[PDB]
Amino acid sequence: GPLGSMEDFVRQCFNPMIVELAEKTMKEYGEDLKIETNKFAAICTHLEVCFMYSDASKHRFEIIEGRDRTMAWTVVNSICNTTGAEKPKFLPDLYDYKENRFIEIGVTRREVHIYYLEKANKIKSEKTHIHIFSFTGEEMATKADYTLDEESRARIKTRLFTIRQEMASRGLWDSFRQSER
Ligand SMILES: [Mn+2]
Numbered sequence: 001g002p003l004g005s006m007e008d009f010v011r012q013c014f015n016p017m018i019v020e021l022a023e024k025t026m027k028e029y030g031e032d033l034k035i036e037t038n039k040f041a042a043i044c045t046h047l048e049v050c051f052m053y054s055d056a057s058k059h060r061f062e063i064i065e066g067r068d069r070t071m072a073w074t075v076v077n078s079i080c081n082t083t084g085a086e087k088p089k090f091l092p093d094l095y096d097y098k099e100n101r102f103i104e105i106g107v108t109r110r111e112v113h114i115y116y117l118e119k120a121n122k123i124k125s126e127k128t129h130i131h132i133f134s135f136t137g138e139e140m141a142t143k144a145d146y147t148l149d150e151e152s153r154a155r156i157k158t159r160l161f162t163i164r165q166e167m168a169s170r171g172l173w174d175s176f177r178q179s180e181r
């Protein structure tokens with residue numbers, strides 16, 4: 001069976017805006033997508049999920065993810081000044097204007113409860129909401145509050161399942177799943 005290249009797959013699978021934002025993220029962090037290509041795919045996947053999460057309720061969420069880091073912090077600080085929300089210690093992915101809280105979106109190939117616990121230990125915040133997705137349909141969220149309804153989250157889960165299936169068809173899934181740290 002042919003083993004495809006992950007860079008080929010990423011450039012064929014994600015829309016060009018997502019690919020370009022992922023390229024800029026990796027440049028900002030001094031990473032080379034041509035070598036760390038599983039990470040390139042992971043960054044693209046996380047961007048796509050953040051955008052889908054926002055699109056599930058247009059106008060409800062401010063998007064923080066995808067922006068360069070300086071601009072992202074400028075947006076976080078603006079939200080905090082406007083809404084009175086407490087400033088997060090690490091850059092979150094969205095701000096929810098309805099529930100008045102920042103959100104960390106996780107997408108993982110590891111077990112979602114462990115990943116959830118790791119993220120909650122990292123950000124160390126009593127306000128920021130965490131929502132973890134896997135590629136096989138499992139999810140986990142702060143206080144069992146999943147924010148979006150079943151139809152919206154099913155759309156996200158189906159996209160993730162499709163990505164995993166297309167990776168597997170190209171012989172890419174085994175390495176992509178194994179390489180997460
Ligand atoms: Mn991020």
Ligand SMILES: [Mn+2]
Binds near residue numbers: 106
């Ligand atoms: Mn993640």
